[PDB]
Amino acid sequence: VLNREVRRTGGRVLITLGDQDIDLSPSFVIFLSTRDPTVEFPPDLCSRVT
Amino acid sequence: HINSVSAMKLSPYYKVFEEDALSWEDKLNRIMALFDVWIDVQRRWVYLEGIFTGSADIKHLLPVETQEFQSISTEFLALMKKVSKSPLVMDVLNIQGVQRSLERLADLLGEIQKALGEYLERERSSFPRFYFVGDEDLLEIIGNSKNVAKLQKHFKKMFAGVSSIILNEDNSVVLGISSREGEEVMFKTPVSITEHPKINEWLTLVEKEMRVTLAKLLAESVTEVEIFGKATSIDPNTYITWIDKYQAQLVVLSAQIAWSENVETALSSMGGGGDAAPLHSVLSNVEVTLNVLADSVLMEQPPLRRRKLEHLITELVHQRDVTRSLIKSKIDNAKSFEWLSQMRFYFDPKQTDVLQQLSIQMANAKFNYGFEYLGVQDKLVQTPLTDRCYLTMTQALEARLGGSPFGPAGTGKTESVKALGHQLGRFVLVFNCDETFDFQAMGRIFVGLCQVGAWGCFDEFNRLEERMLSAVSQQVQCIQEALREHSNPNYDKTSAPITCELLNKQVKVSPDMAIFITMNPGSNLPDNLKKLFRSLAMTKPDRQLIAQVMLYSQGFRTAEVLANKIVPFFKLCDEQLSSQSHYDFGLRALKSVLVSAGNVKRERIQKIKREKEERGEAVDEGEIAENLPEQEILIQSVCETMVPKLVAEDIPLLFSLLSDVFPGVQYHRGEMTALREELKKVCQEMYLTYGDGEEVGGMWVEKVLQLYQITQINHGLMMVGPSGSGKSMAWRVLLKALERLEGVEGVAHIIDPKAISKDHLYGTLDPNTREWTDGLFTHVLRKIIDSVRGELQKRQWIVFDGDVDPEWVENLNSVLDDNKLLTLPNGERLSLPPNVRIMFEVQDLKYATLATVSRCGMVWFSEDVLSTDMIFNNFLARLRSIPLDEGEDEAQRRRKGKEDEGEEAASPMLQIQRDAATIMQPYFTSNGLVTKALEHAFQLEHIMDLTRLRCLGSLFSMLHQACRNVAQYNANHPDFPMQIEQLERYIQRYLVYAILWSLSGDSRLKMRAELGEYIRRITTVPLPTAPNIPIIDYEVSISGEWSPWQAKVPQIEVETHKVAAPDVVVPTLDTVRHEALLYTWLAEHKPLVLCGPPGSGKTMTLFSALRALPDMEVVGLNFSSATTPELLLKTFDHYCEYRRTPNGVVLAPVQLGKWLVLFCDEINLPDMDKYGTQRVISFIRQMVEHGGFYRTSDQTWVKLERIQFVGACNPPTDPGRKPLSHRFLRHVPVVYVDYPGPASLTQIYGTFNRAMLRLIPSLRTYAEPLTAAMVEFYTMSQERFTQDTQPHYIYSPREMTRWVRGIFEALRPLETLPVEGLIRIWAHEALRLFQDRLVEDEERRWTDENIDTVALKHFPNIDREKAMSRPILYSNWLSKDYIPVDQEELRDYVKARLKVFYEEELDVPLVLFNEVLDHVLRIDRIFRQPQGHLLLIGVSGAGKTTLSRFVAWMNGLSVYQIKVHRKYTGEDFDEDLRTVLRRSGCKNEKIAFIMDESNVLDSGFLERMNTLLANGEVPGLFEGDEYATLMTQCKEGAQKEGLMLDSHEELYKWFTSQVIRNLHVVFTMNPSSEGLKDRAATSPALFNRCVLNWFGDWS
Amino acid sequence: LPSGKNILVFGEDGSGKTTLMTKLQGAEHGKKGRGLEYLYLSVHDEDRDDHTRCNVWILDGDLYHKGLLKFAVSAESLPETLVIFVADMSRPWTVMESLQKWASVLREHIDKMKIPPEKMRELERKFVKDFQDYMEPLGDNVLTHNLGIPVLVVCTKCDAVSVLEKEHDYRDEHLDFIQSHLRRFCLQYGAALIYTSVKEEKNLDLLYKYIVHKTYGFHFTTPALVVEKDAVFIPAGWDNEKKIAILHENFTTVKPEDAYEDFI
Ligand SMILES: Nc1ncnc2c1ncn2[C@@H]1O[C@H](COP(=O)(O)OP(=O)(O)NP(=O)(O)O)[C@@H](O)[C@H]1O
Ligand SMILES: Nc1ncnc2c1ncn2[C@@H]1O[C@H](COP(=O)(O)OP(=O)(O)NP(=O)(O)O)[C@@H](O)[C@H]1O
Ligand SMILES: Nc1ncnc2c1ncn2[C@@H]1O[C@H](COP(=O)(O)OP(=O)(O)OP(=O)(O)O)[C@@H](O)[C@H]1O
Ligand SMILES: Nc1ncnc2c1ncn2[C@@H]1O[C@H](COP(=O)(O)OP(=O)(O)O)[C@@H](O)[C@H]1O
Ligand SMILES: [Mg+2]
């Protein structure tokens, strides 16, 4: 979801989440938050987020 | 769905679907509005059903509620029938008026439940002790009002000591009460149940009559003991008669009352005159009574009278001490504090009320004795610390505060509180606070304590968790405030109904009640109760005085010196001896030891008395007791109780400490001549050494004797030695020896508890359709209890041969305790009979609870109880008398002959092996070649833990095969059999060869050479005389002389059809050695195991060697983290079958005359439990060692007949692996398959390349020069790059096979090539297999230079510029053939295809730069190869997961990606693998199976994939009807491809080949920063199986 | 009365299997056929005026034909099955070999029916009760084999004892040693034992009454008969090794532990 890995099939734009393949609506936006300022995130997440 | 619709209401595009959404919202709400009610209407009904049909008497108690529940049950059953006829949710929702009907049912069921709760609360309040009883138990009590026997088990919860009620023969009148010990109190006035039919009424009358009769008997007891109080001399007979006539509690109370009254009268009489004569008289009387009791206790007494005498002695010693203190202090007034501070008893018989007759006073406190029957309780030695505890606690009770005796563990805190409560006659109820804290009854228990009047002590209140601590703290705070409200003077108690808020009700609090909170510092009491509780530091109890009083109680003449010696000795043992969990030098152990010493003393008195009586003598118990050593009895008791638990390292330290504390006193072991003779006979019968102590085998004989002693004493015991110490053999010998000694048949029931599930072990209750299924242990217990075949006459021992864990021993705690009762969820209570003895074998008790260890006796079988000499003697004895070929039919005939006369020449095999034992005896001596070799080998490091018995069993099996080989030579040379000279040379060489392959068979080649050098130093046998060859490289021929293994390895030629998949292994030196060992260790049916680094070749060698044998039927099972005994049971059900025989049920393969062998490819990989045991490994261990297992469904023993196991492994150092149990590694001989090395690789790939070059006939001459290069560079890489620099720099022959496959696929479509083109393809494959995995640029430069160097070295006169240009690229897109292409043309083609890809699948620009075209080509290349799996590792981003998709789209591979959910069990991954495999193989649809680290979080499912990566088929996926469907689709696909196949095996092989060709796996990972993940660095097997590509970061 | 009840008849060829069952059917001439023969007994309850049939399946002497048992009994009909092992008293030296051979063949068939182990333990426990619940009109030295199903051993041609005594020098000790071995085998399978002759009509009514008693619950009053060497009758649940040991009092040349083929 952070990487925007849309899979397009006809008009259905799926994205995998757990078992389900859900339809990405255009309006979706997510903001991640951290109250802890002492955190070491993985390099996997750093490339996927600003 | 409701939340999602509510969220959809906020969507900007919601207006279009609004009306439809609203409709569903209504339906969704209605569905919830139904089922939220429905579950309630179900639960209450189920609950009410469980109450209204379980008891038939509930109808009479609650008729109206019964009728309402009948009318409700009918309606609910009708509704449920209607639902059953249409179980759809929408069909159910549309039932007419279902909502109103269910609401009516909920309301009425709630009303009936409320009525039942009110009725039960009324019954509880009528007889308050029921508040200590649970709801189901109270319902059982009231319902079974007419079946009084069922009530007998619940009295232990309600009353302090009443275990049962004595009843008239017709059960209409209660005559008295009885304790656990059998002590009975007969009521003066019986309670007539017929006149008071209600349970509460006659139970209240029983309590009242118990108190009245106890008071009336205490009156008579005091009246009688007053005579002894005022008498100068006491007649022992009258005193003993008085003790017998009255209960222990009344006896001690009478003694205390008499002493208190006598001292009070004395102090009144002295009255300021200073005349101390009356106190001297009191002390004289007390001393006379003490002398009478000391004389009486040495005699033999019944147990109850002995307990009464011990209590009286313990009380009178304290009375003597107090009177001596008063005389020394010159106390001369009854109101002096020195007398008031001592507890005093004032009995006023004239009081009409029977609860204010005895008044117990201490300083201010003035309690009354609540006459609650306590039975024969354990009295406490009134030390000064306990006296302080009593004083402070009574002061706190007088001030209405709570009590808090805090201190370290085992300091008498809870026991002291219990003793104080029992001294005042108040019911104490200790609440444990260690994971058994039943909260749901705690409010009920508090209300019961408040209403009835009873104490409550929380043992270790610190151990409650924070929520539990806070809630209980609040409840106790409310109770303590209610109690403190009594103390105020203004509140007049004529009308003062004190109350407390408990369970949202005003509960009346009686003043007699109190609460105590024991604490363990390290700490403080909760802040709620710090003000309300008085704390006392019970830091250090008085060990010396407790020991003194107890030893005096047992009749020891000297107690002061013995106590002062034994007490420091225990602390000395606690400090000096090595800390172990099972050691227990606490006060409970000391008191038990002293009681044992008293028992031993009394036994010695009886022994001397009977010995003198058989002679002519005059007998007196006191005279015999006078001239005995008390120290010898005490040291004997200490040794008998402690030495069995002592480790061999600690026994000499213990003896040194005992000599220091007890100088000049030694413990001579009691001689058991008969048992020792029987042990000698059985040991000779079973080929075991026996010794008379301090000889070869003395320690083992001593340990079995100790085992006999512990079995005699306890009803449950354990053997907790390390693996290979003879505990199981010792127990077997003991049973077979007692069989002869006592003429009682010994039966053994051996159970592996961890192999079987707890539900099967103890039997599980069906949650519905109530029926009981007996578990295995319960089945055995029921079988012995019923005694259909007279099992009570026989003696049966149950042995739990497996690791002890808390989970499966919870039910066994009740049996192992003094109760001896197994309780099951069925409600049945099985009484263990005296014949049963529950036994345990454990390598260690690391995960055993202290509760389990305390209940059981123990004999620690230290590893130095079985010397090497004993095992060698066992081996040589087995050889001389067990024919090695006759098998099991003649096993029974071994017992037919007591000596087997005339059967010395049973067969030529016996003679040959006897001669072999004669040749082998000089090398098996205590300081022979084998012993020195083993001691040196123990120094060497081995990948698996080196245990002595594993090496010895391996060596014995190899020697067995040596004599079998001699027998084979004799059979093949009937005209002249083996001569003794050739036999001597052959066995002498074979012993060295077997020594090397048994000891250094688990080590590397260098260490095998080291052991060979050491053997060459110490051996007298000649060895090979070739300098630069290891000894292990040589075989021993049938003739004595050595011969190199290289002669026996043929040079073969492989077909071009199978150049990279000849599953038949190319014969190499390691392969021939390992198959020779495989045959040698399979001849004995031992479970072989092979370890080694990934790709070493163990699986192929095992399969080829097993399939070479004609009889062996291989079943390929692959183990994983989730594998269990179920896999092996399913495999047995598939290939094998159970058949009944008179010996017993036997499991055998369906195919006659074939040995079924199970391949367990990854024995290490199964996950350990929380307690460090693999279930399947234990299951295999019990099968291989006991030769069978227990069918759980039938709960019956079955024996394997032709089943074997042979496993493969990676070393346990690898991340996903685990070490194996030492009880399991003992049986299996482990071989280490290291990498082939240069010579073996050259031979193998010479065969492969000679096969590969057959396609082009002009390049055959260049086969051998190429093969060295493929080896040389590979070895150079193996020397330059190691796992230390990067975790994925792993090399193995799998890389070489990939190289061969790559060259083969390059050359297959090509009609011809020049030598330079072959060199170019070789260099390209080198770069694509080795240069890609590298991380650093300079390493890539080194590989670039080294490829050129190796090529020009092995291909001279070939110009480098034409043969190998640096920008080497091979591609198939430009032309139909796989031929070299230029960079620019490939750049243009890929750019065009990428621009196409932009507007086809994903609209995001993708730039082609120099370092991404190369990755595109690499990914395409791995896609073209067979079994081509890629592992892209690199920085986050950089193209992985985007290049893989791009190349997959370009090559037409449909991309499949796994979607892991939560609760995504391994079955879901199995189904996904089944679907993709069916698509790839049956439908011939190429798939790129992309996997990412995000969905590869769990490593459990990534070992199912390793089988696919290595072989392309994962056995066990399609088992069942899925196999039939896959076979049908597979044959349809084969017909589509044009091949007609019939056999299922050939169709499966073709399906596997299709899966190899089509399905590809693309793993994507980040570099090794995933330490937090379970993978850490993923397994090196995964690195080996795939082709690794380092993506790196953009330059 | 219940329908679908079955009788499985086993034994060597020439033992009497077809002749015994044909005579019990009230027929003079039953047609002999290689493989698996079939006939039915008509059963009538005079106290109730009702009548049913019992299926009788007779296996050939050749082990080649043991596959045909699948057409006689199933995992469903086994609870409704009585087993008859036919022992040939004109060839006593084949009786223990025959009884072990046929019991093994039946067991090899029961194991192949894959009966649910719970249902097998229900039948086994019921048969242990149907054997312990015997009394003349727990303690154990019996049912080592425990077929767990009704079993009857029928000795046929017992009149041939009068030829063994005259042509092979057989004596009371040989007949009691045969009787003890037969009784020990009957204890292993929880079986009944009956001696019969179709030529002298000995025990034919007793065999029919015992079959209908164990199969349909008919009343039975005959006690054990152990004094007549050629007419012995022992019902399932009557016997034990102490009742067998009385036969050892007549042993003068053989022992209770000596092998059957060494003496017979
Ligand atoms: N003597 C040999 N002849 C031919 N190929 C060999 C030989 N020895 C090793 N190999 C190759 O070595 C590779 C490893 O084979 P394999 O037996 O699957 O290793 P492995 O140890 O079983 N892998 P694993 O089970 O996970 O530990 C294959 O490519 C084999 O072809
Ligand atoms: N060569 C390229 N040119 C342009 N964009 C690229 C290129 N390679 C990757 N991207 C973009 O980079 C983003 C992430 O690429 P991707 O390789 O899928 O991440 P990733 O490696 O899969 N991270 P992860 O899956 O957690 O290992 C996507 O938006 C791609 O379109
Ligand atoms: N008294 C003895 N004399 C000689 N050899 C013995 C004696 N007792 C045991 N052994 C040898 O030691 C082996 C191991 O002993 P035992 O079978 O009791 O196993 P154990 O110590 O319980 O080990 P494990 O942990 O493997 O179960 C025996 O198989 C036998 O070879
Ligand atoms: N003063 C004493 N007199 C006799 N026995 C004592 C005395 N103090 C302690 N003990 C023994 O030591 C043991 C200590 O255990 P317990 O009091 O139950 O828990 P803890 O002491 O850990 O609070 C008891 O079983 C008790 O028999
Ligand atoms: Mg053991």
Measured CA distances, B1313 to B1246, B1308, B1379 (Å)? 19, 11, 11
- What's the CA dihedral at B920, B924, B930, B934 to 10 degrees? 150
Backbone angles phi, psi at B420, to 5 degrees: -65, -45
Nearest one of B1264, B1262, B1270 to B1316, comparing CA atoms: B1262
Cα gap B794→B16, rounded to integer Å: 84
Tell me which amino acid residue B483 is.
L
Q: Contact B494/B488 with Cβ under 8 angstroms? A: no
In a 3-state reduction of DSSP, which class is residue B293? helix
Classify each residue of B971-993 as buried b or exposed e, where b means 16 or more C-beta atoms within 10 Å of its C-beta: eeeeeebbeeebbbbbbbbbbbb
Q: Contact B947/B1222 with Cβ under 8 angstroms? A: yes
Nearest one of B126, B145, B267 to B199, comparing CA atoms: B145
Measured CA distances, B1083 to B505, B1067, B1069, B1115, B1136 (Å)? 78, 22, 22, 18, 21
- Tell me, using a 6 A CB cutoff, whether residue B1236 lines ligand 1: yes
Helices assigned H by DSSP within B152-276 = 155-158, 199-229, 236-245, 248-270
Q: Residue B769 is encoded by which pair of tokens?
A: 């359709």
Q: Which long-range contacts (CB under 8 A, 24 or more apart) does B908-914 make?
A: B908/B967, B908/B970, B909/B883, B909/B884, B909/B885, B909/B963, B909/B967, B910/B881, B910/B883, B912/B963, B912/B966, B912/B967, B912/B970, B912/B978, B912/B983, B913/B879, B913/B880, B913/B883, B913/B884, B913/B963, B914/B879, B914/B880
* Cα torsion B1408, B1409, B1412, B1414: sign: positive
Tell me which amino acid residue A42 is.
P
Beta bridge partners of B801: B841
Nearest one of B1138, B1202, B1152 to B887, comparing CA atoms: B1202
DSSP B1160-1203: ETTSS-SPP-TTS--HHHHHHHHHHHHSEEEETTTTEEEEESSE
Classify each residue of C173-201 as buried b or exposed e, where b means 16 or more C-beta atoms within 10 Å of its C-beta: bbbbbbbbbbbbbbbbbbbbbbbbbbeee
Measured CA distances, B871 to B134, B895, B1297 (Å)? 58, 22, 46
DSSP B138-173: HHHHHHTSS-HHHHGGGHHHHSSS--EEEE-TTS-E
In a 3-state reduction of DSSP, which class is residue B1345? helix
Could you say which of C118, C121, C138 has the minimum Cβ distance to residue B786?
Answer: C138
Backbone angles phi, psi at B358, to 5 degrees: -90, 125
In a 3-state reduction of DSSP, which class is residue B360? strand
Measured CA distances, B1578 to B253, B1161, B1295, B1470, B1590 (Å)? 74, 19, 18, 21, 15
**Cβ neighbour number for residue B321 with a 10 Å cutoff:** 16
- Tell me, using a 6 A CB cutoff, whether residue B792 lines ligand 3: no
Cα gap B64→B104, rounded to integer Å: 18
Beta bridge partners of B1535: none
Question: Which residues on chain B are in Cβ contact (under 8 Å) with A18?
Answer: 1459-1462
Measured CA distances, B420 to B253, B424, B480, B669 (Å)? 13, 7, 19, 42
Q: Contact B861/B730 with Cβ under 8 angstroms? A: yes
Q: Which atom of ligand 2 is nearest to the CA of B1412?
A: 1
CB contact under 8 A, A8 and B1401: yes
In a 3-state reduction of DSSP, which class is residue B1135? helix
Burial (0-12, 13-18, 19+ Cβ within 10 Å), B484 = middle
The enclosing H or E element of B65 equals: helix B63-84
What's the alpha-carbon Rg for chain B, to the nearest Å?
42
Q: Contact B1183/B1189 with Cβ under 8 angstroms? A: yes
The enclosing H or E element of B1009 equals: helix B1005-1018
The structure tokens 């189920």 sit at B46
Q: Residue B1440 is encoded by which pair of tokens?
A: 């992985």
Atom 6 of ligand 2: nearest residue by CA position? B1406
Tell me which amino acid residue B1080 is.
T
Q: Which residues surround ligand 5, an ion (CB under 5 A)?
A: B 728, 841
In a 3-state reduction of DSSP, which class is residue B813? helix
C17 is in an annotated binding site: yes
Burial (0-12, 13-18, 19+ Cβ within 10 Å), B1470 = middle
In a 3-state reduction of DSSP, which class is residue B333? coil
What is the greatest pairwise CA distance in chain C? Answer: 55
* Cα torsion B1403, B1404, B1408, B1411: sign: negative
Q: Contact B613/B686 with Cβ under 8 angstroms? A: no
Q: Which long-range contacts (CB under 8 A, 24 or more apart) does B201-206 make?
A: B201/B126, B202/B174, B203/B127, B203/B129, B203/B158, B204/B126, B204/B127, B206/B165, B206/B174, B206/B177
Phi-psi bin for B1463: left (phi > 0), alpha (psi -120 to 50), beta? left
Nearest one of B755, B756, B1515 to B1120, comparing CA atoms: B1515
Measured CA distances, B1105 to B53, B187, B962, B1113, B1203 (Å)? 66, 84, 19, 12, 17
Cα gap C181→C261, rounded to integer Å: 11
- Per the structure, the complete domain to which residue C185 belongs is given by 2-264
Q: Residue B1304 is encoded by which pair of tokens?
A: 């083969």
Could you say which of A5, A19, A43 has the minimum Cβ distance to residue B1566?
Answer: A43
Measure CA B146 to chain center.
45
* Cα torsion B773, B775, B780, B782: sign: negative
The enclosing H or E element of B1391 equals: helix B1383-1398
C16 is in an annotated binding site: yes
Cα gap B561→B860, rounded to integer Å: 31
- Tell me, using a 6 A CB cutoff, whether residue B1246 lines ligand 1: no
Atom 16 of ligand 2: nearest residue by CA position? B1437
The answer to whether residue A29 neighbours chain B at the CB level (below 8 Å) is no
Q: Residue B1447 is encoded by which pair of tokens?
A: 């190349």
Reported as half-sphere exposure (CB side, CA atoms, 13 A), residue B22 has a value of 4
**What is the CA(B883)–ligand 3 centre distance, in A?**
21
Cα gap C238→C224, rounded to integer Å: 7
- As a residue count, chain A comes to 50
Cα gap A40→B907, rounded to integer Å: 76
Q: Residue B1329 is encoded by which pair of tokens?
A: 């297999």
Report the side by side order of strands in the sheet with B837-841: B746-751, B795-801, B837-841, B716-719, B857-859
Nearest one of B1227, B1233, B722, B1178 to B952, comparing CA atoms: B1227
Cα gap B1205→B1404, rounded to integer Å: 55
Tell me which amino acid residue B1018 is.
I
The enclosing H or E element of B1240 equals: helix B1237-1252
Classify each residue of B816-852 as buried b or exposed e, where b means 16 or more C-beta atoms within 10 Å of its C-beta: beeebebebeeeeebebeebbbbbbbbbbbebbbeeb
Nearest one of B1051, B1061, B940 to B1003, comparing CA atoms: B940
- What's the CA dihedral at B462, B463, B465, B466 to 10 degrees? 10
Nearest one of B950, B1046, B1049, B1042 to B1001, comparing CA atoms: B950
CA distance, residue A9 to nearest chain B CA (Å): 9
In a 3-state reduction of DSSP, which class is residue C206? helix
Q: Contact B166/B175 with Cβ under 8 angstroms? A: yes
- Interface residue of B1436, B1569, B1593 to substitute, partner A, most A CBs within 10 Å: B1436
Q: After which residues is chain C broken (C to N over 2.5 A)?
A: 137
- What's the CA dihedral at B244, B245, B249, B251 to 10 degrees? -80
In a 3-state reduction of DSSP, which class is residue C197? strand
Q: Contact B721/B863 with Cβ under 8 angstroms? A: yes
Cα gap B1559→C198, rounded to integer Å: 75
Q: Residue B528 is encoded by which pair of tokens?
A: 């709620």
**What is the CA(B1561)–ligand 2 centre distance, in A?**
19
What is the greatest pairwise CA distance in chain A? Answer: 45
- As a residue count, chain C comes to 264
Q: Are strands B1188-1191 and B1196-1200 parallel, antiparallel or unpaired?
A: antiparallel
Nearest one of C61, C144, C68 to C102, comparing CA atoms: C61
- Interface residue of B1139, B1143, B1195 to substitute, partner C, most C CBs within 10 Å: B1139
Measured CA distances, B1441 to B801, B1447, B1450, B1454, B1491 (Å)? 52, 10, 14, 14, 9
DSSP state of B1272: H
Q: Which atom of ligand 4 is nearest to the CA of B586?
A: 12
Nearest one of B1161, B1069, B1151 to B1106, comparing CA atoms: B1161
Nearest one of B267, B241, B245 to B334, comparing CA atoms: B267
Which residues does B1578 contact at the CB level (< 8 Å), separation at least 6? B1215, B1499, B1502, B1565
Q: Contact B457/B484 with Cβ under 8 angstroms? A: no
Q: Residue B1033 is encoded by which pair of tokens?
A: 């490289």
Helix axes B248-270, B277-298, angle to 10 degrees: 160
Q: Contact B1088/B1283 with Cβ under 8 angstroms? A: no
Cα gap B1582→B1194, rounded to integer Å: 42
What's the alpha-carbon Rg for chain A, to the nearest Å?
14
Backbone angles phi, psi at B1336, to 5 degrees: -90, 145
Measured CA distances, B1412 to B1379, B1394, B1397, B1446, B1588 (Å)? 21, 12, 15, 12, 16
Nearest one of B1045, B1008, B1007, B1043 to B1025, comparing CA atoms: B1043
Cα gap B1413→B1404, rounded to integer Å: 17
Question: Which residues on chain C are in Cβ contact (under 8 Å) with B1191?
Answer: 117
Task: Tell me how many degrees the CA angle B1488-B1491-B1492 measures, rounded to the nearest 5.
Answer: 140
CB contact under 8 A, B1140 and C111: yes
- What's the CA dihedral at B200, B203, B205, B210 to 10 degrees? -160
Out of B386, B389, B393, B415, give the residue to mutate to test ligand 4, the one with the largest number of ligand atoms within 8 Å of its CB: B415
Cα gap B1552→B1558, rounded to integer Å: 10
**What is the CA(B1507)–ligand 1 centre distance, in A?**
13
Which residues does B353 contact at the CB level (< 8 Å), separation at least 6? none
Helix axes B1443-1450, B1383-1398, angle to 10 degrees: 100
Measured CA distances, B602 to B296, B297, B628, B630, B1359 (Å)? 12, 9, 11, 11, 105
DSSP state of C225: B
Cα gap B1247→B468, rounded to integer Å: 73
The enclosing H or E element of B950 equals: helix B948-972
CB contact under 8 A, A44 and B13: no
Nearest one of B481, B509, B515 to B496, comparing CA atoms: B509
Question: Which residues on chain C are in Cβ contact (under 8 Å) with B1140?
Answer: 107, 111, 145
The structure tokens 């009857």 sit at C152
DSSP state of B1114: E
Which ligand neighbours the alpha carbon of B1223 most closely? Answer: 3
Number of structural domains found in chain C: 1
Q: Contact C48/C37 with Cβ under 8 angstroms? A: no
Cα gap B718→B842, rounded to integer Å: 8
Beta bridge partners of C50: C45
Q: Residue B607 is encoded by which pair of tokens?
A: 């022994």
